[PDB]
């Protein structure tokens, strides 16, 4: 796990509308294990489902994504989970919507 990464700069403000942790994958419509992109805030399924967030990474280059299952943040380039106070707000907003 990383306490910081050089890609945290890419994290954009949480949408004013907030987050929807039950939002379907934008490609396959599944609800199983979705992630939200911390740059564009599109929602796509994890790599153990249909890999649409991975596809999104491939298309966009956006580095950091947040899990709607356990609120872990993954950096595709660092290939690691990253935890940092820069992510405090987004994780809280997700948590509040979830519970």
């Amino acid at each position: 796990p990383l306490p910081w990464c050089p890609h945290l700069v890419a994290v954009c403000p949480i949408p004013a509308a907030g987050l929807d942790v039950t939002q379907p994958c934008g490609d396959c419509g599944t609800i199983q294990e979705n992630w939200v992109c911390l740059s564009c805030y599109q929602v796509y399924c994890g790599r153990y489902i249909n890999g649409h967030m991975l596809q999104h990474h491939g298309n966009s280059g956006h580095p950091l994504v947040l899990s709607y299952i356990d609120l872990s943040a993954w950096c595709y380039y660092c290939q690691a989970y990253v935890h940092h106070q820069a992510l405090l707000d987004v994780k809280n907003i997700a948590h509040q919507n979830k519970f």
């Binding site: 992630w35 994890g46 994504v65």
Partner: peptide, 4 residues
């Protein structure tokens, strides 16, 4: 347990 790989993310993303």
């Amino acid at each position: 347990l790989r993310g993303g």
